[PDB]
Amino acid sequence: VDFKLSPSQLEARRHAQAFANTVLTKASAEYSTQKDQLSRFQATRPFYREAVRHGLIKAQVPIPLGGTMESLVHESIILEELFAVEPATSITIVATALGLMPVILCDSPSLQEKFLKPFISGEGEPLASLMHSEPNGTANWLQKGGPGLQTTARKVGNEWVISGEKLWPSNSGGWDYKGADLACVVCRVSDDPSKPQDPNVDPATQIAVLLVTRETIANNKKDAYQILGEPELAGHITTSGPHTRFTEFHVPHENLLCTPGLKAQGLVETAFAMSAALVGAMAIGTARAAFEEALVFAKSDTRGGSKHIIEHQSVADKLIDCKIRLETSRLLVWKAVTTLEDEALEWKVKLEMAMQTKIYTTDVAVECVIDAMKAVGMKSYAKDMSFPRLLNEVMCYPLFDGGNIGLKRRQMQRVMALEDYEPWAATYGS
Amino acid sequence: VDFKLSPSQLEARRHAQAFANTVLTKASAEYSTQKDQLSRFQATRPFYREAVRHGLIKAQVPIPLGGTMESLVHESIILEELFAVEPATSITIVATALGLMPVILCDSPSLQEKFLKPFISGEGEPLASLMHSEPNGTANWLQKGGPGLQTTARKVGNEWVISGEKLWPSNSGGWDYKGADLACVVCRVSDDPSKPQDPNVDPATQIAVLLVTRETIANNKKDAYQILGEPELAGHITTSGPHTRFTEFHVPHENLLCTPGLKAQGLVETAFAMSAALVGAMAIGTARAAFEEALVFAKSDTRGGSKHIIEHQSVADKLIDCKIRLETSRLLVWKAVTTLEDEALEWKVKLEMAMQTKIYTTDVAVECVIDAMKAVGMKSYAKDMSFPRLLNEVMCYPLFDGGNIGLKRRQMQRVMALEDYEPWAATYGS
Amino acid sequence: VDFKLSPSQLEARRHAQAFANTVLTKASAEYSTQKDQLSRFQATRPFYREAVRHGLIKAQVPIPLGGTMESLVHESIILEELFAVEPATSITIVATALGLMPVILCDSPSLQEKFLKPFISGEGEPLASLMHSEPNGTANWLQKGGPGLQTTARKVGNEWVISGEKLWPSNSGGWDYKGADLACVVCRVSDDPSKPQDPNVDPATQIAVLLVTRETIANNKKDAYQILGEPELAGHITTSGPHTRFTEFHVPHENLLCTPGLKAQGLVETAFAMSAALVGAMAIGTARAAFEEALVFAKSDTRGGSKHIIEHQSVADKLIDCKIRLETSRLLVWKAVTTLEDEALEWKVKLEMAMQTKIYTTDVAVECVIDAMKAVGMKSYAKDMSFPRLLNEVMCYPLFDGGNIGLKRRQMQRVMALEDYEPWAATYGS
Amino acid sequence: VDFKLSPSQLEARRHAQAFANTVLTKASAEYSTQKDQLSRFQATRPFYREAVRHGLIKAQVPIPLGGTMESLVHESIILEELFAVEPATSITIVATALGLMPVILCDSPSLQEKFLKPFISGEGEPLASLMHSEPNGTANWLQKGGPGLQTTARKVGNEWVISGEKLWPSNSGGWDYKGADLACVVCRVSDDPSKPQDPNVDPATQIAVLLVTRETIANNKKDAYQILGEPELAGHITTSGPHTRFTEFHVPHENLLCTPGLKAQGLVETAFAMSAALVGAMAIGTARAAFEEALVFAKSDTRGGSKHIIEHQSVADKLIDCKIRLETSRLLVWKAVTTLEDEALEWKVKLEMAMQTKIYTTDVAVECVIDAMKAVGMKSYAKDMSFPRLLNEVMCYPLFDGGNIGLKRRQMQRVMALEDYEPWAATYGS
Ligand SMILES: Cc1cc2nc3c(=O)[nH]c(=O)nc-3n(C[C@H](O)[C@H](O)[C@H](O)COP(=O)(O)OP(=O)(O)OC[C@H]3O[C@@H](n4cnc5c(N)ncnc54)[C@H](O)[C@@H]3O)c2cc1C
Ligand SMILES: Cc1cc2nc3c(=O)[nH]c(=O)nc-3n(C[C@H](O)[C@H](O)[C@H](O)COP(=O)(O)OP(=O)(O)OC[C@H]3O[C@@H](n4cnc5c(N)ncnc54)[C@H](O)[C@@H]3O)c2cc1C
């Protein structure tokens, strides 16, 4: 076993760190002066443009698919660097990557050739969005006997018709609410949407994923794709994650990602499980930022006393705790992503690992930010330090990308309950 | 022992509820439109007026001084209710109550009579403020060998001259930066401001407390009292705790609160400790709102499944933990304030009860809010629910009124270390 | 609201402290040489004998019923003092109280007189035991469509026939495995035990509580009542709580506590809800023993340093956390028992309060002892200190009297889920 | 980076499991019948004899020094497997390792040849010990101004004389109280044992390590070396860790490990930082044992209900948290031992890593066992399950090998306070 980093891993770090310091630090001045989420999002476009220019969107796509992603570790290193400085635009890069996952993971080169084209070109500002979450929630979307997704699709001739609403999917509306360049819309298949899901058919066999470009939207009546709102968020105040209403929305069959049923469900599950492992890099960034800021403070400031604040035991205790939290977190992300990349390991193992990582790193990041604030004291509470931003931004991570309570612990529980569950397969083998 | 609320106590709850509901719920519409801390604070004035019109400022003064304060239990019941609904204005009430504290506590009836008058009148918008905190902080203000407080007063003729900077103290600059109607300004006595504190004389013996009114401010050069900044706070976005510079500031010797040194120190210590017991009501209030909103949602939303979300063991586990934290908190405040009121107990015992209370209640209310957010999931993160505000507001408590790490844990540590410490004296007597 | 103790409450403490110091401290010398639970239990007999002679068994019975219990707070104070010193015997006393409760709560004066007789006589060493728990568990004993209690009863002639097994019930075997002087056996009614419980009937309507005395056991064949084992416990090594089998065990109809069904279930629930509020004082005793021994140590040992170990912040923080946990715990227990005695409040409010209290006090007591051990350091690990005893002892409390995870938190969830749940009823009325 | 295990590492696992399964499972039948610590320890000899025959002692010594240690990761794996079945004898192996370390790490070949010879022979039952700990404790042994170690050495002519007491060092008195085969007695240099350590010499300059064999003891007077008593411990009841008095104890100059002062201290600091990393494996083994026992239980027992107890969310949560603690810990330990093996990194980076690892793993292993118990419920409290043994054994870990509170957090805090502290050197290089 080996923890040393390769030159390209060390270079990716230099690269991202450079891009955040020289480019993203300037982001704040443009967005702050806007009135709402949408405007704050729009004011980000130049910085997303610059990330495309730096090859960061191309780096969200595997090399064999023409992208430049070298490994999921490389990715982990890059995301931590971005988020330790500015979660604005950074968040848009990762929402795009999630939007690309269902295509990256489908086993179909002509779909991948087509839809991945803009995102690997090194130009424009193409966005992507995995449109899953809904106003009524999704933690139970696969419960047998329940509602199921309220966004439904049905086949009508040689095209599909979507009906219902999505909430929260980042980038869904694109820069101008004429849609994301590529959006994967997850649907429950139902003939008559005014009839409830059959309580006797396993909801997993009823899942469809329809791709929706700006063109699909243009080829529809203006009212079939309505944007009802844009939630005002506590943190990450520059992302966009609109409310959206499909009313008789027509989608070409050439746009269906795969045969409906368990294969579609499985792609979504595989897409969300991989980001689940990556989200921890995001969390580690925000919390690294809190720790480092607090560290520096405790080492230069006596707070009215004779010695530096770090020389008090309880102040040290907090910084110790934050540090352990960060270290263990980054170790677990690296373990998780490496596990997803091991071809010899059963999926359940890869899934169990990814949930742990998402659960631990995200829960523990919050703790870390708060402790850092406590060590610093009253000064952390004012907007001339980072913490007020960091406080709101960190609280997103345990709730999003599938909440820990409702989704992540549930998926893990399920795997642990199976007869053939091997707790240490990721570490010791079968 | 008995926990039953008397009629007067039940009416103070009713009254406080009815005030928050019909008056404080309208605050947000005014301040939401403002563009910075101070503007936000000013747009609060009409609401402070109402609080005076309901005698809520008058209730901050004990009856022996012509106020309406029935007891510290009443007080706790009042603050909790106010803060459950809206901390704006409500924070100004407590800051003004803090400001009055050392006058209320001193041995001088004629000083009391003179300075309390506007606050027991039932008219206008009288603000008070206890000015202790400084830019270089204060957890060590009494460390023998330390720079001490950097706000110093010397005697010149029959007036005192203040030099130095204050940060944080709520209401210090009044509604209009012409100052509070009463401001206890805490100073270190130093004949030479530019010399360091004599490392040989116990810092406690150098404390003077000087009363500064709006009048005192007018009868001085405009550049002797200057407001340098208003910190943009993470939560409590409508308070004012500005950065004040005293350069050559003249204060009548008549306005000296008491004999400098041990007595002055004793007044500050007794004020801050008292408020430290009451701060928990503020914490409980805020946490209570997080919990209630979360419970109501938990009991009425199925989140896309077949049962209310509260039928999920993990959800209920959060709510239970929240409820537990709240019940234990309040009990501890009541025990606390009662203790401060029992004249048969030594001061060190009360000090211990008050430190405990502040530490537990405020640490635990943060946890309470976060768990409640985790229970509601993703929705808790949009500003169409109360949590974003609460998250921000709740992080003030362990930090403010003497942070738990620097001060409260230290004061409590000092007490337990004393040879005649009696851990249970507050329950079992001596 | 009032927290001051009465003269009779102070007497209860002194009386309990004195009993503990003078009597219970001599027990370790007797039980230490015994080589199994039972022998350790039997060696405890002369200490229970003294506890009776001191009127402590009489003080488990309310006054109208011919006993000397003055209030539940008195009870709480007493038990805390007892468990602060020595769980041996003390556990036997409260276990007897438990065993007596169904009879105390039932509203049948002639049953009480007969069965409560020896426990108020102040002579001998009468044991009572509430026999509920079973080899197979009990967290789900009320689950409709589940197996239900495996101890079942049927009527035949004018007597009831019990079959099945009990496990864990304290004192159930008496001193000599010929039975407790009074055992309350909780049975599920079933005419044919070979048949599973009917999944279409609500399990609570099949509950029966059968009084079993030493004489009852004498009237049966030898293999109708069999002790099959004595669990060796991690801590509380002097208590007895054996594995009993009933085989065609005959019990007279007169010995049935009340009519089978919801009335009998209600007696069982009421009993355990009451014990659940009191168990905290047991938890407080142990945790206090830990806290005190650490405090004394931390104030008189420099651990090779130049100052007392309490002077180091990390140490003080531990002890601070211990104190807070203990203060809050005792506050909650007192609240809980007051609530139980408040006649103007609905059972569901009382239940919730009790569940809350058992959960908090027992979870928190454990952290308190571990923190105590941490502060003291390595020395806490050796049996010339109390900590090894306390560590094993405190771990019992979250597990026993109905575990927090399986039972307590479930009963509390059920109540909070109820449509007409008043979370603050116990505090602010209805 | 890479997590895959090599053939030799998996064989090391296989081999440690088989040894634990076929040999260590048999220890308890011998040591359970015994009366005190020492006898229990002595009943352990045939199993240590079997350990030596399997080459497990030889594996504690690096290959360049005649032993068969392959790497520290190998070592981590071995310890985990051992401690997951039986810490008896296992504890003796790692104590011997710790005892051999300072000979292993000094750069003096003739000492290495002479004193390591028996431990690499694969023959007999040789024991070693690192005698550092003392009655008055040691957490402050390097504090400038303090009394320092109380075991002192003075040079008299051509030999060294030892005056003072040691407590706790495992194996220190050998099998028969005629001494460990190798003792590294850590002393403070003082010509006059009666003189307090000079408050003006940096204590690290006065440290000496003297090597004591069974021969050194035979060549001394009978009462120069007295075993004053064997502490009766909470868990790990089969280890020996005597109270030892050196009175005028004569040691050959050639048995002096290195030059007194910074060199000697450095050897001690290094030995202990290394074990600090390894110790985590021990904590993982214990905690894993708890976790696996609870997991199997939950996956197969319904506790009187209709579904396996793992189907309940509160049970699943506990096991998830357990799992997450175990996973992160192993990762951290492997990261630690790896960091220690890196020659490119500075000592302070390695020490900060080792400190982190000891703290996290030992703290968190406790929470793991206790959560495991609460999952299982009542049944974990009886000795027919592993849990009682585990609870006691797991509380050893945050306290021992230099407790987390007094030593480990202080060593770490010191590192972080330094001007040139790089938090992430071990991850992202210097
Ligand atoms: C910045 C940001 C970016 C986002 N990007 C995307 C995106 O790219 N794509 C996308 O699809 N969505 C996106 N969303 C939504 C995000 O992925 C959410 O996590 C998603 O909405 C799921 O919400 P939830 O986990 O709170 O579950 P919800 O269904 O909303 O339930 C909320 C809570 O109810 C409880 N609960 C419900 N059911 C159960 C149960 N079965 N067992 C136990 N507890 C239960 C839990 O406490 C849970 O936390 C984004 C949101 C944000 C803020
Ligand atoms: C809404 C609001 C209202 C306020 N109202 C008032 C008011 O009315 N009057 C007033 O005076 N101030 C007021 N302030 C400030 C408030 O009282 C703060 O608690 C005060 O500034 C103390 O800050 P601090 O506790 O962080 O200690 P600081 O002195 O600022 O120290 C900062 C941190 O350093 C560490 N530290 C420093 N010394 C030690 C030590 N010796 N041991 C261990 N750790 C140490 C601690 O972690 C501490 O938290 C207000 C602030 C706000 C936000």
Ligand SMILES: Cc1cc2nc3c(=O)[nH]c(=O)nc-3n(C[C@H](O)[C@H](O)[C@H](O)COP(=O)(O)OP(=O)(O)OC[C@H]3O[C@@H](n4cnc5c(N)ncnc54)[C@H](O)[C@@H]3O)c2cc1C
């Ligand atoms: C099974 C077992 C095996 C052992 N094997 C060995 C061995 O092989 N070799 C050996 O030398 N010893 C051995 N010991 C002892 C072990 O190394 C202990 O960790 C050591 O005795 C130091 O204990 P301590 O950390 O509690 O320090 P102590 O000095 O005993 O301190 C006690 C407590 O005081 C407090 N404290 C003291 N100073 C400070 C301070 N500066 N700041 C904050 N808090 C402070 C801390 O809370 C600390 O926990 C063994 C013990 C056991 C149980």
Ligand SMILES: Cc1cc2nc3c(=O)[nH]c(=O)nc-3n(C[C@H](O)[C@H](O)[C@H](O)COP(=O)(O)OP(=O)(O)OC[C@H]3O[C@@H](n4cnc5c(N)ncnc54)[C@H](O)[C@@H]3O)c2cc1C
């Ligand atoms: C000193 C002592 C005295 C005792 N005295 C008595 C006595 O007087 N009378 C008596 O009857 N017993 C007595 N016992 C036993 C005691 O009351 C136990 O608490 C009782 O056996 C219940 O066990 P349990 O709570 O672990 O539930 P179990 O039914 O054994 O459940 C075990 C575990 O499974 C899980 N679980 C089970 N069901 C659920 C669920 N549906 N939801 C979530 N999790 C679940 C939980 O983790 C739970 O902790 C005594 C024991 C001791 C040690």
